[PDB]
Design a binder for this molecule. Structure first.
Ligand SMILES: OC[C@H]1O[C@@H](n2cnc3c2N=CNC[C@H]3O)C[C@@H]1O
Ligand SMILES: OC[C@H]1O[C@@H](n2cnc3c2N=CNC[C@H]3O)C[C@@H]1O
Ligand SMILES: *[C@@H]1O[C@H](CO)[C@@H](O)[C@H](O)[C@H]1NC(C)=O
Ligand SMILES: *[C@@H]1O[C@H](CO)[C@@H](O)[C@H](O)[C@H]1NC(C)=O
Ligand SMILES: *[C@@H]1O[C@H](CO)[C@@H](O)[C@H](O)[C@H]1NC(C)=O
Ligand SMILES: *[C@@H]1O[C@H](CO)[C@@H](O)[C@H](O)[C@H]1NC(C)=O
Ligand SMILES: *[C@@H]1O[C@H](CO)[C@@H](O)[C@H](O)[C@H]1NC(C)=O
Ligand SMILES: *[C@@H]1O[C@H](CO)[C@@H](O)[C@H](O)[C@H]1NC(C)=O
Ligand SMILES: *[C@@H]1O[C@H](CO)[C@@H](O)[C@H](O)[C@H]1NC(C)=O
Ligand SMILES: *[C@@H]1O[C@H](CO)[C@@H](O)[C@H](O)[C@H]1NC(C)=O
Ligand SMILES: [Zn+2]
Ligand SMILES: [Zn+2]
Lengths: 497, 497
């Protein structure tokens, strides 16, 4: 008889469950006594919310649309703890989508020579023109200063601007109830801001706001996708990508010199995957040059924009292989968005295969990865971190209930993962705290606590592209931040005995 | 590494080919006729996927069954799957596996059938041969009278159907949460409980299960049944052994009539809301029926909603009782387990106990992909997972069926059988709708006839037939399969490649 007694049964059961706990993300962490006190409180809070949903038969709010869950999570102890927690790094961000829309309204649209119009789809668009109103090509441009002053209600005018630009004004899952409907709205958001946010002094100040906001959410380091290209002055001068990179380099240096508690930033060049291969070839050659001449600030290349209907990595393969085929070879690093799809066995999810054959340093999203066991092997063996952006994946149509997020089985296998926010400005998320909350509450289990948070945070520095000296310094800084957070949390939540 | 495109293509195809060989059906070698049919299926599959992807419209096979049912039935892939022999349906409930239309057109035209509207405004049906039923909570009326007085009998019969089916409206819209749709699902069983437990109706309904499944080219079924409490017009209530004997006689006569049909076996089910002392008695009952009806009575299962009710651990001394006897008794178990979006809770840990208790198959296993060690045990022991895709969508585990958690199981060749669960409740066919959505949503664009053939063979090879019965059933299946291949080549004009 295998289990003659309860003790024989529970011994076997606990060993099996415990063996899976050791295998998941953070499973090898041993919390010290202070960490255990905070962990016990977190786990009591997590069990309370889950058991109420389960036994009282009501929806699990951490997993519903961010439009509904945002205000609810923010009043809770687990959220407040994650808010205070050092996040380490945000490794997957876009430079025109990572600061507050409120700043675009309150700062950028109060500058001289800013114009607005309503397009044929009934969305506001903003731009800058130093030579009077722009040509009225399908849009009647009006000076924002004049429109605001004549609105009859300035605060309502500014609120309307924000409401017309944000994807969280209504619930995207209701208003745009399909992948291509919500991607139409997402694409529209960037068209709305494209004019104003590519004006050079506004772009410079918006990037600085990214750094300020991320530091304020206790993020010490960022790596940012940027097109780098087309920043324009009041007189119409258009700058080249190298200038855009130098501009970001100077903003970053000033910021780190001001704030020694912040590790810094590095940049990935991005190009939209709607362009012809001749354009991508030029951008790959550009990236080769910037990688050689700006090492340790310029990281490499990525292809962005909607993955399902547009060009595959294989569609660009001659350009993407070109650096490795040079004599001598040049190893241009790649950070491909890849597998951001519900499709299986198609050209889209097979981008994951090409991303690994091209030696990607990290993979963006990887939502389809759990359907690809041989790709998982390569991701684990090579230490290619998957950048998991849970709010983005829900709002942009990959999943509804976040407990169905395809990264949960990756985390259970200890696939290397970093959490990031992607485009937090677009849908009014915080730099990291909202995404870290949904990952913690939806993508791991009821009995997964502070060890999971600690591992994800450390992962974001370990799988950053900092060099050895930078990374050693950043990890010492993170450890100091972590110790302060543990001590502060015990006092705040009255857990010291 | 890739000086030319040939070397790049070879590594790409090696990796992709490795995954195709690993997944369900990857080792099958199709003969030349099967290859012709496979080529047409794959051409059809790519055409629908490419249209959704490139023309940016929703992928109908993956939307609510309420929307997709009428759309899929006109397509060649569905028609091929309809003609295809399915082998076996291994996960079925005996009060939910024949048409509601038969309940209306046959059962409610029998003498002594009564109806009432309950406090939630749903029709309930029952039989009373000893006067009208007592008006406890609702006012019972003779259906014969209500129908004759309706002034539109067609509309009256259609109203009965509409008031009982869960597909009258889209359950994802009308009952938009787990516990709302489970409320509706529970209500369905209450609506029919009285009438479907009347012995002659219960006998004839079970016969209709076999007729309908045979008509959908299913040759064998294993069915969950409570067995107990069938009642006569004079009020006699029968015991579980009588119920089992009734089904056995129906099955034997059905197989006599239709030698092209392999037959049926029965699993005793009990709802997991009862006290442990009652489950103990049902285990003892099952031990006795297993001993005295070997080869017709299979074992035991716990059913009803998994999340808010009793866990397997909550019954563990009852479930361990057979193994603890002197000499031990191995009562086979078929647990519904892991039918949940929860992780790290008592609900998904039912999967651990199902393995420790030596379950022969696991029902649903939706949470299994979150449990890497349980996956390896399921694979090494050959414990088939009964995957019920329409059920899991309608009953609230997933919205887009491409996020179904069995897709990553199939990609690793976890042993899986497709079944329909409760096809009569929501107007599905015995197997063809579930096999279509499995084929279109749970495997990839490049997965063809080999996946279908493997799933069909799996349903016999992981059935509870003994080895001799399996050989006989596979001979019959092979003959059906060969006829299906030849017929399909003629029907779809494929004979000349
Ligand atoms: O100007 C920014 C560019 O980046 C795209 N972009 C911004 N966020 C994402 C993008 N692209 C792909 N996947 C979804 C998400 O991760 C939009 C635009 O082309
Ligand atoms: O009388 C039939 C019983 O079976 C349950 N039942 C029927 N179908 C299912 C059930 N239980 C659990 N999971 C969903 C699905 O697989 C309902 C009722 O208690
Ligand atoms: C269910 O809700 C009630 C209040 O409505 C509360 O008393 C009880 O604790 C809840 N149960 C759980 C397990 O949260
Ligand atoms: C906008 O930001 C700039 C740069 O930080 C600052 O100088 C300017 O005063 C701001 N505008 C307003 C209205 O605060
Ligand atoms: C944007 O503003 C216009 C004009 O007020 C309004 O009609 C439209 O609904 C708004 N769109 C969104 C998405 O808020
Ligand atoms: C990828 O990296 C491997 C290991 O360093 C190297 O040998 C190979 O040439 C690289 N391939 C490409 C295409 O860059
Ligand atoms: C998209 O639709 C058009 C007709 O509207 C059709 O001709 C075309 O082939 C479709 N594209 C695909 C890839 O199916
Ligand atoms: C109902 O089924 C029974 C048994 O199969 C049959 O005798 C009877 O004719 C049927 N009733 C109707 C109305 O078809
Ligand atoms: C059932 O019938 C009643 C009475 O006609 C009707 O009001 C109710 O909406 C129906 N319910 C469903 C779920 O169809
Ligand atoms: C499970 O099966 C194994 C192998 O047949 C057997 O040794 C063991 O006793 C069984 N365990 C239980 C709990 O029935
Ligand atoms: Zn992105
Ligand atoms: Zn079931």
């Amino acid at each position: 008889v295998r289990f003659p007694t309860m003790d024989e049964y529970t011994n076997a059961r606990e060993e099996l469950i415990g063996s899976e706990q050791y295998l998941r993300v953070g499973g090898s962490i041993n919390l010290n006594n202070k960490e255990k006190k905070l962990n016990q409180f977190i786990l009591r809070e997590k069990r309370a919310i889950i058991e109420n949903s389960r036994l009282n038969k009501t929806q699990y709010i951490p997993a519903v649309s961010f439009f509904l869950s945002k205000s609810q999570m923010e009043s809770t102890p687990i959220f407040k703890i994650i808010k205070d927690m050092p996040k380490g790094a945000a490794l997957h961000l876009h430079d025109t989508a990572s600061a507050r829309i409120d700043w675009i309204v309150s700062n950028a649209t109060y500058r001289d020579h800013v114009y607005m119009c309503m397009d044929q789809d009934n969305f506001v668009r903003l731009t800058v023109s130093g030579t009077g109103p722009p040509a009225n090509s399908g849009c009647e441009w009006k000076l924002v200063e004049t429109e605001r002053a004549n609105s009859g209600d300035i605060a309502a005018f500014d609120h309307w601007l924000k409401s017309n630009i944000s994807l969280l004004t209504t619930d995207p899952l209701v208003t745009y109830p399909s992948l291509d409907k919500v991607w139409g709205r997402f694409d529209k958001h960037f068209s709305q801001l494209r004019g104003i946010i590519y004006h050079t002094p506004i772009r410079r100040d918006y990037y600085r706001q990214i750094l300020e906001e991320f530091r304020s959410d206790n993020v010490q380091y960022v790596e940012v996708r940027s097109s780098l290209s087309g920043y324009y002055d009041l007189d119409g001068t258009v700058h080249d990508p190298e200038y855009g990179l130098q501009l970001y380099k100077a903003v970053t240096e000033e910021f780190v010199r001001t704030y020694p508690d912040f590790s810094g930033a590095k940049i990935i060049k991005s190009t939209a995957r709607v362009k012809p291969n001749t354009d991508i070839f030029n951008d790959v050659k550009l990236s080769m040059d910037l990688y050689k001449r700006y090492p340790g600030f310029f990281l490499g290349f990525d292809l962005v924009a909607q993955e399902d209907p547009n060009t595959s990595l294989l569609g660009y393969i001659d350009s993407l292989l070109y650096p490795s085929r040079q004599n001598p070879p040049v190893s241009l690093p790649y950070y491909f968005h890849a597998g951001e799809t519900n499709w299986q066995g198609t050209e889209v999810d097979y981008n994951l295969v090409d991303a690994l054959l091209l030696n990607a340093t990290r993979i963006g999203h990887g939502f389809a990865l759990i359907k690809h066991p041989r790709v998982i092997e390569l991701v684990k063996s090579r230490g290619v971190a998957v950048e998991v952006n849970p709010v983005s994946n829900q709002l942009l149509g990959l999943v509804k209930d976040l407990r169905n997020h395809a990264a949960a089985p990756l985390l259970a296998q200890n696939v290397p993962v970093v959490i990031s926010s992607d485009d937090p400005g677009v849908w009014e998320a915080l730099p990291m705290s909202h995404d870290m909350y949904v990952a913690f509450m939806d993508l791991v289990g009821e009995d997964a606590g502070l060890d999971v948070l600690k591992q994800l945070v450390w992962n974001s520095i370990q799988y950053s592209s900092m060099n050895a000296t930078e990374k050693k310094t950043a990890l010492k800084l993170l450890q100091a931040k972590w110790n302060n957070f543990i001590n502060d949390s015990l006092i705040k939540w009255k857990l010291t005995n």
